[PDB]
Design a protein around this ligand. Structure first.
Ligand code: 8L7
Ligand code: 8L7
Ligand code: 8L7
Ligand code: 8L7
Ligand code: IMP
Ligand code: IMP
Ligand code: IMP
Ligand code: IMP
Lengths: 346, 344, 341, 346
């Protein structure tokens, strides 16, 4: 007869999908990477460094802003220190600066301090943004500071986009469990594969007039293209920047190789417990400028392939196909002994 | 001969976050193992001669869960193990029973030791022997709580509930030490088996246990969200200090023995349906339970669930590919520090 | 002026045996000192300058209990002492705090050293100084576990709980070296004090410590059965090798110094005396005997655990003739017993 | 000078030699391990823990003394902290205690403080004990504190035993370059293989009535037996003790293995060009379990040599040299070892 079936939707990450080429009348050197992070704030490139104590303090935020993106100063420091870090960025030539805020008893004291330091945007930043504490936190902050730009996260559903927008958020940050250092999905069982999360959240954001950020799980420049084509206004990265000279931490040498420490903000070491992150090391990659150069070149390439002179046109005309694990093997270089370094592929 | 659908295990799915007004410290983990038996936490140790004797059962009960004393010992020895648990403070205790000639003698002895629940536990619970065993036990001991298993279908839930079972145990082939699916070709991926059976149990008012295949705390959250009243583990507890067997050292690492009850070694106490081996020593049970419970409480916070029933009622799963699985785990990082709830 | 009732000490009372299904060896002695601090055995060493420094505190923690480092030293030294215990491998450690001008700066240093619990310890814990002290410490360190004492009434339990104490310590005048009752006229016999204060603490969810007056392992059973979460001892531990002070010999007998912190010596109108007690050797040997006697009593009371012990505790009062029956009598004891005088 | 460079002889380490069994009328349980560390200090067992900041503080010294040996508190701390450390050991039951001293401008100030804390022996301890600084230091200390017992080192020649004895040392410590964490021989080219160094220095020491300590390079209990049979009054170990619970440092876990930090005092990290390295060794649990194995091995060796006492062991010990082929025979060979032995690893 006609049978009863279990309805379970498949959700996709970046490695599950590829963008289909469009007719193109634009060369990659003709495209524009400008984006609205919020209605108020424009970025020259759609890239953000993560608010992590192994990724962004003022050194990284200054370099990020000079490249045309933005850094979010992490909050694993006293209120006074975080205000000093923001102020250091703001004093370095009018550069944009963000600051992370938690759902804490001293939440507004921290907001007041970074506001006095002239922070451009705050990120009310929690493991579970679709929550009463974040919703009320946003309302409180916007009641006191109606023109202060507020990003709220992290979330993974359209319903969360709508609730945080109604609460007064100027932008929402998408990502539950995709981070390279993240164990949320493993230890709590919860998350949404990040390409689907970004797509579904950005679609709701577009209807509401609120942008969304694709936060976490990005490894290659092509991953960022997919996130922007899916509708994200900007991409946030920890792992891709944590090995740069401008990130916190010393350069460590071991058996002829250079490393920097990178760790989840929910790892034991960062929290110092039931942790939701791990602690480790990644390759030292040198100055941020050289990593940004490769990322931008890759984004401009993808836009050339899709005929997009702007990021809005990229989203409007992007079509995806799903690839299998065998397609993934074809997409990567295969059947070759790679003997020389490539600046954008490892 | 027909292909019904794709069936999923825990690693195939993820739970979607819900709007939440409850923090992880505000949630309740209480659960009805049967209508008569409540657990403070939804966790059980397996009835395996390398997992649960009285030492483990006492520890499990003091943590709020329950141990099932295995049956690879004489009847008198199993009765004395149960008795040691019950005298240690009215702690809950279970006991495994097989489909054997002396089945009722063994039931009589653990009933005398005041066991709270027996598990009539077989490779194939959806069988005449188990059905007739449950009916015989309930006829002599109408109020004795009986778990029957193992099973993997809604039909088996119906047939065991009709026989008189107060709870049914799901899992055909998911065990870490299990070769049933390989040697016999039979089984149902465990997440689908639990969703299918727990939905059937809910209609009939009979709880179901998610037994086998659990590796991380998030796997338990998925099993509870799918509707199981409790989760049963061998591998996760077999390395604990309270499990049977000596701590053994090999090249600077501490190990304990862990084996299937259908392995040659356990049956010798011949076509086996299990293997024998070693897993890492984990220290005291309390530290493992703390991580499991913290992960469960975190998952319930993400789903806005103050109770296990609300967790089930509002749980939505999505399927992830193997690319999604690689994103879900830590990736592109050389991990250099131990984490207490994650290993690779 | 009114006489409320007769009040009892440990020697006034005996526990009635219950039907039991537990052997002593199967018993569990874990207890919650506070909501956050669990002990494997319900025993604490007193914060006196002849009982607990880091050496004693480490030994107590290794045995499953805890030691409270006395405050008769500079702030810097007491932080060093706490430091030494905490760096000795994740052992629990407490520290004494007084109602003093430098109270918060002493608290600041011991929390810096990662003390697990503070004891705001005065002669009269039911006082404005202690109540406001507790309030000040809790406002600055909301997570810091705080024991407040000493007290002897349920009203004091209620007031210190409302001030934010996580545990209260009971004992006005029972100490072996104490003269408070003789010089001030004030105190409550300790078994009644513990039972009346624990009853109020149970209703508020706040544990009580039975501090002082314990001589034998059976006394500890009575204090725990009366409702205390833990027993604190000075005299029983002062003769152990791990307590401060040298071993002194006289007439073929070994002794150690033991004195009240309100005695003239310690303060250099006293409420304590100074003297000597027998050397007992290593703490481990004393703890073993205390734990054996406690497990024996719980066996007799059918209590596999300590909360069940309070619930099922029935005392009878004995006379001085009953007391003479309870002790060995009409025997010339010729052999030493490890748990009896 | 008309002298010329020359090659003197072949020199041997412990792995180069074996002790020949003697006629025995003594069982291992009948032998006595007592030894004179100096004319005034007797030890119940001939074992010492090294004065390193990853081996011996008050906890280790207390446990070593409880076992019948002695610990030397390291000097990588303020004078006050080292006096406090000696004080903790002394008040723990009158246990023996040692303390390290360097050739520094504040040498006498440090000596004064540990003397007040009632230290039983100081070790004037430098990379090159056969030097003017150490000789004058010993003389200066012996002038102010004639009764204070003084060990001086490290040395590797009979001439150095003679000169330190003439300066007033009560005991000399032998070892240039044998340490597990030592690179002196690699970076400076200097040292003497430790068995020959101990044998030759102990020969001079017995002629002058001054004991000598065998410091460094010991890995197995049988190595201690060789060092004592060569005439050392005691054996000093860093590596064998650094993994014990009583040594300083946290227990680190990595891939199911427990570790403790161990590093040379001449390494970059401890100095805070190097002559040591920094690393990790296996965690061993409590000192008592390690001592038990070492003492049992020593007693067994004394049984094999019919020695009821350490002086008898030395008087009647005969060595043979083994080749690298004899060494392969001496270790287990041609076996897949499947069970841990408590006194044999790798
Ligand atoms: C990025 C991640 C994963 C991370 C970073 C640093 C730390 C963490 C840790 C490891 C601390 N885990 C969580 O915090 N787990 C969590 C789970 C469920 C829920 Cl519901 C919540 N609630 C959150 O939102 C509430 C306000 O509404 C707050 O109380 C806040 O706790 C948290 C995780
Ligand atoms: C958990 C596993 C896999 C396991 C544990 C220990 C031992 C076993 C062994 C290795 C013995 N294999 C089975 O027993 N294989 C089996 C296969 C098909 C069927 Cl139908 C049955 N029948 C079962 O149910 C009947 C009730 O009537 C019983 O008589 C009983 O025989 C068994 C396996
Ligand atoms: C008897 C013991 C344990 C002892 C220990 C060391 C020393 C002492 C000495 C011998 C010094 N005697 C007292 O101190 N006697 C005393 C009597 C009555 C009162 Cl009311 C108070 N003080 C109270 O007044 C403040 C009111 O806010 C509170 O903070 C609280 O300190 C003290 C005695
Ligand atoms: C145990 C070792 C190897 C060690 C431990 C910690 C640190 C060191 C360091 C790495 C510091 N290296 C030396 O110190 N190298 C050295 C080489 C040749 C000579 Cl001659 C000397 N002179 C020494 O003896 C003189 C007595 O007067 C002193 O002045 C002193 O300088 C030293 C090494
Ligand atoms: O410990 C954590 N657990 C889970 N997610 C984390 C944790 N710390 C940081 N994150 C998230 O992971 C992102 C970085 O991911 P990555 O670019 O893939 O390394 C951050 O921007 C946060 O959204
Ligand atoms: O040898 C056997 N073959 C198949 N399943 C077994 C065998 N022994 C135990 N089991 C099952 O495996 C479960 C433990 O699975 P684990 O938690 O994944 O190690 C037990 O609770 C039993 O249900
Ligand atoms: O001099 C004092 N006067 C009154 N009580 C004191 C004095 N010094 C210490 N105490 C108390 O007496 C207890 C020890 O009593 P013991 O165990 O009977 O020796 C300590 O824990 C304090 O509560
Ligand atoms: O960094 C250093 N370089 C050379 N020798 C050292 C250094 N640090 C300690 N030592 C010596 O090495 C000994 C320990 O060697 P082990 O017992 O073989 O590990 C110590 O007792 C010192 O004599």
């Amino acid at each position: 007869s006609n049978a009863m079936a279990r309805i379970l939707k498949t959700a996709y990450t970046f490695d599950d999908v590829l963008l289909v080429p469009n007719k193109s009348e634009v060369l990659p050197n003709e495209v524009s990477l400008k984006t609205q992070l919020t209605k108020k704030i424009q970025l020259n490139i759609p890239l953000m460094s993560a608010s992590m104590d192994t990724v962004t303090e003022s050194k990284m935020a200054i370099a990020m802003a000079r490249e045309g993106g933005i850094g979010i100063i992490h909050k694993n420091m006293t209120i006074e220190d975080q205000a000093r870090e923001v102020d250091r960025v703001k004093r370095s030539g009018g550069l944009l600066c963000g600051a992370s805020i938690g759902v804490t008893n001293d939440m507004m004291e921290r907001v007041d301090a970074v506001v006095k330091a002239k922070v451009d945007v705050i990120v009310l930043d929690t493991a579970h943004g679709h929550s009463k504490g974040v919703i009320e936190g946003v309302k409180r902050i916007k009641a006191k500071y109606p023109e202060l730009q507020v990003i709220a996260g992290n979330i993974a559903t359209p319903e969360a986009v709508r609730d945080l927008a109604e609460a007064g958020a100027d932008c929402v940050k998408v990502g539950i469990g995709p981070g390279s250092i993240c164990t949320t999905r493993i230890v709590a069982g919860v998350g949404v594969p990040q390409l689907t999360a970004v797509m579904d959240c950005a679609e709701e954001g577009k209807k509401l007039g609120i942008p969304v950020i694709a936060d976490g799980g990005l490894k290659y420049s092509g991953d960022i293209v997919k996130a922007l084509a899916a509708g994200a206004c900007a991409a946030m990265m920890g792992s891709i920047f944590a090995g740069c000279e401008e990130a916190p931490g010393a350069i460590e040498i071991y058996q002829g190789r250079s490393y920097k420490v990178y760790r989840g903000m929910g790892s034991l070491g960062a929290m110092a417990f039931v942790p939701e992150g791990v602690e480790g090391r990644i390759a030292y990659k040198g100055h941020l400028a050289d990593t940004i150069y490769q990322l931008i070149g890759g984004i401009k390439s993808g836009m050339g392939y899709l005929g997009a002179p702007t990021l809005e046109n990229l989203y409007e005309n992007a079509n995806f196909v799903v690839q299998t694990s065998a397609g993934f093997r074809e997409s990567h270089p295969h059947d070759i002994n790679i003997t020389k370094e490539a600046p954008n592929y490892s």
